[PDB]
Amino acid sequence: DAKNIKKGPAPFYPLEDGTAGEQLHKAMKRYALVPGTIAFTDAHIEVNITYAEYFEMSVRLAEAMKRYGLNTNHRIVVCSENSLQFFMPVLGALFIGVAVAPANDIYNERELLNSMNISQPTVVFVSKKGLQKILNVQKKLPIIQKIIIMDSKTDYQGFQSMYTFVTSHLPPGFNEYDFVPESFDRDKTIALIMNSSTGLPKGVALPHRTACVRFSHARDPIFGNQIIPDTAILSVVPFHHGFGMFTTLGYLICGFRVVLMYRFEEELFLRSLQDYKIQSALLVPTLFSFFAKSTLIDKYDLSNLHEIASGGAPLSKEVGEAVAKRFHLPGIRQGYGLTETTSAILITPEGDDKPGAVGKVVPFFEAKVVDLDTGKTLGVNQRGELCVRGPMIMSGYVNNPEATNALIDKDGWLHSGDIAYWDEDEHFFIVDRLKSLIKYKGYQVAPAELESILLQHPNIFDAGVAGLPDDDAGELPAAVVVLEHGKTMTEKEIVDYVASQVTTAKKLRGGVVFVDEVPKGLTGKLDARKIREILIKAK
Numbered sequence: 151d152a153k154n155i156k157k158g159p160a161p162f163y164p165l166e167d168g169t170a171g172e173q174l175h176k177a178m179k180r181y182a183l184v185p186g187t188i189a190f191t192d193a194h195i196e197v198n199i200t201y202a203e204y205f206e207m208s209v210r211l212a213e214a215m216k217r218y219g220l221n222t223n224h225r226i227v228v229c230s231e232n233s234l235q236f237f238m239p240v241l242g243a244l245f246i247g248v249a250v251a252p253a254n255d256i257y258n259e260r261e262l263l264n265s266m267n268i269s270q271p272t273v274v275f276v277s278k279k280g281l282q283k284i285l286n287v288q289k290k291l292p293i294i295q296k297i298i299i300m301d302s303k304t305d306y307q308g309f310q311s312m313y314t315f316v317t318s319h320l321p322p323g324f325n326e327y328d329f330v331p332e333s334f335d336r337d338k339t340i341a342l343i344m345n346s347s348t349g350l351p352k353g354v355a356l357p358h359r360t361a362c363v364r365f366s367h368a369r370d371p372i373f374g375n376q377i378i379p380d381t382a383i384l385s386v387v388p389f390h391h392g393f394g395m396f397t398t399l400g401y402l403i404c405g406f407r408v409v410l411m412y413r414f415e416e417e418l419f420l421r422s423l424q425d426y427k428i429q430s431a432l433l434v435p436t437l438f439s440f441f442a443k444s445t446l447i448d449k450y451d452l453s454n455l456h457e458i459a460s461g462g463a464p465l466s467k468e469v470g471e472a473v474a475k476r477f478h479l480p481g482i483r484q485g486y487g488l489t490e491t492t493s494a495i496l497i498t499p500e501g502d503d504k505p506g507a508v509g510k511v512v513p514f515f516e517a518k519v520v521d522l523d524t525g526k527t528l529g530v531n532q533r534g535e536l537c538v539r540g541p542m543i544m545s546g547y548v549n550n551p552e553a554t555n556a557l558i559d560k561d562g563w564l565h566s567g568d569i570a571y572w573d574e575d576e577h578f579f580i581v582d583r584l585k586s587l588i589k590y591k592g593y594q595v596a597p598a599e600l601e602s603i604l605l606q607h608p609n610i611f612d613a614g615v616a617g618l619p620d621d622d623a624g625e626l627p628a629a630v631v632v633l634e635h636g637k638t639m640t641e642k643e644i645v646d647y648v649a650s651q652v653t654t655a656k657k658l659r660g661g662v663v664f665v666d667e668v669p670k671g672l673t674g675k676l677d678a679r680k681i682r683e684i685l686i687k688a689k
């Protein structure tokens with residue numbers, strides 16, 4: 151009974167041959183030749199850019215980079231916040247086979263270093279506002295030869311724009327419509343180097359195959375959205391941290407108009423939803439809970455709105471139903487995905503929504519639950535660790551096969567670290583830190599309630615509450631604590647403090663264990679074991 155191992159259906163679109171760059175180029179060239187087809191729309195400055203514009207300039211950046219000298223043994227960095235120019239160097243680079251590491255616009259200067267030491271990039275594309283931060287970081291990274299400014303047409307601080315850079319390297323008679331992109335092995339050639347849990351962000355290497363699969367999902371009437379003319383999307387989610395990246399690529403495959411918003415604003419948001427006739431909106435999790443509090447939605451004509459998507463962020467069932475009610479939608483489309491799996495591999499399918507589920511397994515994939523101790527795969531309705539195997543899994547963490555391994559067993563399964571179960575109808579469900587309850591006496595306090603108290607203390611930098619299992623009491627509630635840098639404290643001084651703000655059953659009878667860091671779990675969510683694990687010895 152390899153039969154409690156859950157399997158994604160058949161694709162509507164078969165996987166297509168070619169690299170990620172070869173199929174983007176082929177799709178975009180189709181839409182380039184229809185004048186007026188809009189690719190991106192900047193909701194802030196109201197400017198539109200057509201596929202003809204988008205195709206042509208991307209191609210030129212590909213042949214201008216090829217000439218400069220970049221082959222698949224080089225990487226570039228794109229450092230900018232969501233913009234009309236963002237996917238120009240990305241598209242151009244994939245056409246070449248150069249690996250793209252999107253960097254985080256307002257990563258502070260330290261996290262800009264950690265990202266770029268892993269990605270070791272020859273050329274860096276950057277927005278005017280990102281420039282000095284990358285200048286500073288270039289004087290600490292010798293590999294960064296060239297800096298190109300994305301949001302200019304002229305040069306800017308003597309530095310060169312994509313536009314003058316391209317005319318500085320394209321050969322005399324270059325022809326955007328005779329360009330052909332490189333063929334290369336899509337399994338070994340890295341398309342994207344993404345970022346990320348505990349410690350410092352790693353570099354998740356993802357080869358062209360994962361985007362090629364993604365391109366099969368995006369069109370899927372069940373797991374993506376149907377190629378209808380005049381489809382538009384309002385995307386707020388960042389063009390890096392996952393979601394934003396691979397929906398937009400799939401959206402360019404489909405010919406959709408991607409309406410981007412880089413700064414969030416309620417009225418701007420809702421009006422763009424209305425005016426652009428948006429079919430589906432993309433949101434980050436805490437923009438869902440915001441929209442649960444919105445009372446203006448009713449004043450806008452969202453007659454056209456079909457879907458609101460949360461991506462690979464699993465949603466509180468209460469927040470999801472709230473958002474969907476304020477917009478008069480049957481449901482939210484939530485899914486579960488890891489950066490280490492490119493896109494989501496659990497997605498709620500069209501129509502088949504089921505209250506509280508993230509969804510079912512995407513085509514090309516297998517997902518299963520495994521018992522946390524024996525490792526044996528479990529059956530229907532049992533909670534275990536969620537494990538997934540399929541083409542979109544990360545190739546590895548750059549410069550870190552010690553982490554790549556033991557995250558992926560060499561039967562090709564990624565072990566999520568997150569806990570789940572599935573239905574007799576094959577829906578999956580994710581279990582969160584946030585409603586695992588600590589039974590002392592026999593009534594239970596949420597660990598988030600006790601964490602909120604602990605984080606309130608000026609000398610407690612981070613906390614993590616879990617239930618110390620003791621034989622007499624049932625569960626004594628305990629915490630792992632991280633002290634602020636200057637400060638010093640004592641276990642009892644900490645529980646004295648809690649036991650002054652909680653009922654008396656909610657008191658921190660389990661004690662505190664001082665840790666350098668509270669264990670997170672891949673999607674950043676607090677890991678309920680390890681914490682429980684950590685306290686069990688210290689007692």
Ligand SMILES: Bc1ccc([C@H](O)CCc2ccc(O)c(C(=O)O)c2)cc1
Pocket residue numbers: 367368373374375391392393394396397430457458459460461462463483484485487488489491492493494497
């Ligand atoms: B960390 C992370 C990793 C991956 C992702 C996925 O790319 C989301 C994919 C998705 C979800 C819902 C949709 O409706 C659509 C779509 O519009 O096709 C697409 C999100 C976060």
